[PDB]
């Protein structure tokens with residue numbers, strides 16, 4: 001059997017039947033992919049991407065509690081909150097907020113199997129007062145806080161960073177670092193996720209395996225390898241494979257791998273809630289040997305320009321209308337969205353190691369993630385898109 | 398209904414109805430055998446044999462055949478088509494398939510044997526030849542010289558594959574149809590011979606057996622069927638012919654797939670297929686089947702053709718009915734291809750594969766000729782270690 005060494009290559013349609021929350025999340029997902037479409041054009045084609053959609057949508061829903069007129073409407077049409085209140089006459093703007101309140105309590109309250117935490121705050125220079133009505137509704141429907149701030153006082157910068165560092169179990173340590181002290185109003189958005197794989201990867205099987213970066217160049221990456229039951233699907237139209245990795249607790253990661261290098265662009269341009277639904281319904285259960293590169297993404301963006309490209313402009317102009325937030329003229333200077341995701345043999349943001357034996361003895365198929373791929377992290381019960389990212393190069397952050 | 402036809406050529410449309418008959422015949426034939434037995438038939442041969450025979454039938458006798466063979470669905474599918482369209486199409490198909498071809502050998506044995514007592518109308522004899530390359534021959538099932546001559550002739554034709562074509566046949570036989578399709582092809586993606594090894598193969602929910610499993614790498618098209626929960630792998634032969642491997646995920650899946658298989662289903666698989674570089678494990682096997690399709694054809698609805706009170710007026714002047722419809726065939730699948738006699742040892746596998754697919758459980762296989770969409774063969778491998 002020296003052959004195994006030689007053979008080896010080593011060395012509405014959608015809304016039908018969906019709960020009210022799921023519908024909202026279908027719209028939030030639609031926005032997310034549109035946002036991604038815009039974000040991707042602001043980064044190199046060879047860079048990885050990582051964002052937490054539910055965090056962005058929740059930040060916009062919250063901020064809008066204090067917006068009015070066109071300013072408010074640009075935000076609601078583009079976030080697609082409109083499409084929702086329109087889906088039926090039994091809804092309304094307040095419905096969006098109540099639904100978001102339920103989602104937030106449901107997602108960010110102690111849960112079994114994983115840790116989901118949200119940082120959704122608004123910081124406003126102490127010179128501009130914050131209307132109490134806005135302050136309580138934010139805390140009421142989003143459990144968030146509109147805090148008074150002082151971007152020129154290192155005591156404020158320091159306090160916030162430590163808060164976020166604790167909240168994210170030491171993951172995010174520089175939330176408000178390198179921020180212009182002349183800032184008047186900013187949004188800090190960050191979702192923290194810690195979970196473990198239903199099908200873990202035995203640590204001794206991780207090894208160097210070739211990963212294709214583009215049509216003509218490959219690199220070595222730490223490749224994890226495991227066996228187990230996984231749902232998977234193929235998309236003939238977009239020519240890509242979709243593998244579903246389950247975390248304990250009702251949360252999964254969809255690994256979307258386009259067969260061709262020129263396929264990524266098409267997939268990114270085509271990705272919508274319907275496409276995802278299509279993949280979900282054509283999924284099948286199989287015993288699979290799965291090879292996945294481990295990776296760690298550390299991203300930090302300012303979404304103001306992306307939101308501007310999509311059509312939300314008044315909210316970023318002192319001439320916009322935020323009479324619901326302050327009686328004084330202000331506007332968002334920075335919409336900071338930061339987050340990290342570490343994928344290893346145990347799960348995500350894992351701190352434990354599992355050495356016991358647990359793989360099935362044989363597997364009918366195998367799928368090797370050896371080329372650029374997109375990943376989507378969903379919460380099953382609510383069909384909520386928590387995270388989304390592109391891994392163009394697993395050896396880069 | 399027939400939205401399948403959209404885009405298809407005229408020969409393809411006929412071969413679609415031909416395939417429809419094939420799956421119905423399969424459905425009927427599988428109930429005449431054991432759930433654990435393997436099955437192997439050559440659909441194209443059966444359809445062409447029935448088309449030929451029909452040139453000599455009339456009335457309800459003729460109607461049953463064109464009906465159960467779905468020849469009726471074909472003409473009834475376009476005002477442009479008529480009964481002679483079937484025959485014109487079969488002559489073109491027969492010539493394209495059984496004439497010298499590149500990459501593979503495809504030979505046909507479509508004969509009708511009639512006791513020498515009953516004469517054969519010369520008219521029917523020529524049309525049979527002119528449209529199906531069929532031979533309405535004179536016979537003597539009591540003279541061993543005849544049996545022997547026929548056996549040696551088929552043995553030569555099938556390159557030594559079929560040796561007992563007319564063995565164990567009732568001498569009192571008056572008229573019969575001998576039907577075989579000989580095929581020899583080589584894989585586009587062969588299997589390295591040293592990689593073949595014993596591998597566990599699922600026979601059913603309860604038992605597993607060891608079989609000779611081949612292992613290779615290469616580019617293959619494959620699809621996934623969520624409704625039937627089956628995987629479909631396409632194995633290309635040199636020359637535009639391919640074997641489709643249909644593996645239901647669950648044991649109980651075989652029954653459903655066999656019950657649901659239709660031209661539309663296959664069409665769906667084809668449209669959903671993608672190309673990948675895969676590691677493919679496939680068990681080698683050898684099917685040797687010999688059936689008398691009379692019973693099956695009767696169960697399907699063709700009865701007059703098999704009774705003296707039938708109308709075979711165009712074949713002969715005297716009263717005669719088909720006594721036996723013999724369909725015999727053999728298929729061997731190895732590292733080189735099918736019915737191969739050569740061995741390839743040169744290196745040829747790609748260096749890496751993105752996916753792997755192990756055929757470790759019961760499966761069905763369909764062999765199609767791409768240009769004409771002709772279903773040459775179809776079978777069931779319930780146990781690769783059985784014939």
Ligand SMILES: *[C@@H]1O[C@H](CO)[C@@H](O[C@@H]2O[C@H](CO)[C@@H](O[C@@H]3O[C@H](CO)[C@@H](O)[C@H](O)[C@@H]3O)[C@H](O)[C@H]2NC(C)=O)[C@H](O)[C@H]1NC(C)=O
Nearest residue numbers: 198228229230231232244246252283284285286287288360
């Ligand atoms: C994909 O299909 C596999 C089946 O091959 C599913 O795995 C099986 O999941 C069930 C449910 O968790 C397990 O069976 C149950 O086990 C519990 C205790 O372990 C027992 O109390 C129940 O009566 C039942 O037997 C099973 O162990 C597990 N593995 C097996 C036997 O295959 C898997 O959940 C499916 N994944 C999907 C549909 O997402």
Ligand SMILES: *[C@@H]1O[C@H](CO)[C@@H](O)[C@H](O)[C@H]1NC(C)=O
Nearest residue numbers: 616617618633671672673674
């Ligand atoms: C799969 O791709 C290979 C080249 O990568 C090509 O030779 C083959 O024809 C493709 N599959 C098809 C269409 O048979």
Ligand SMILES: [Ca+2]
Nearest residue numbers: 010208209223
């Ligand atoms: Ca490897």
